[PDB]
Amino acid sequence: ADISRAEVATLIQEAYSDTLLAAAKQGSTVLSAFQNVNMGTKTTHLPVLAT
Amino acid sequence: LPEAGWVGESATEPEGVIPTSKVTWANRTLVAEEVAVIIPVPEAVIDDATV
Numbered sequence: 001a002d003i004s005r006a007e008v009a010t011l012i013q014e015a016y017s018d019t020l021l022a023a024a025k026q027g028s029t030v031l032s033a034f035q036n037v038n039m040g041t042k043t044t045h046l047p048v049l050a051t
Numbered sequence: 052l053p054e055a056g057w058v059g060e061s062a063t064e065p066e067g068v069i070p071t072s073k074v075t076w077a078n079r080t081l082v083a084e085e086v087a088v089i090i091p092v093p094e095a096v097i098d099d100a101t102v
Contacts, residue, residue, distance in 0.1 A: 023054050 005012065037044070053072040061067030 042095070 053074050054070070055072070056070045058069050059066040
């Protein structure tokens with residue numbers, strides 16, 4: 001007597017959304033608060049004023 | 052090496068008979084064997100070195 005939403009079964013496809021993943025990730029506080037200095041080697045020497 | 056002998060004349064006495072002898076050969080092999088080494092190093096050291 002009728003066609004219910006169960007009786008069509010898989011003719012109705014489900015769908016997917018990125019929108020709860022799409023948030024920007026939490027970056028390092030210290031990499032935005034302070035200067036990032038490029039390095040080419042393990043050790044870099046910085047002179048500082050002393051008197 | 053084969054070996055000849057001085058031989059008599061006789062239809063009956065054993066000194067009248069020509070000696071039998073043989074040449075022979077032997078086998079020498081090249082057998083290929085493997086010589087090898089592994090030299091591990093940090094990927095950071097490969098990145099920081101100037102050469």
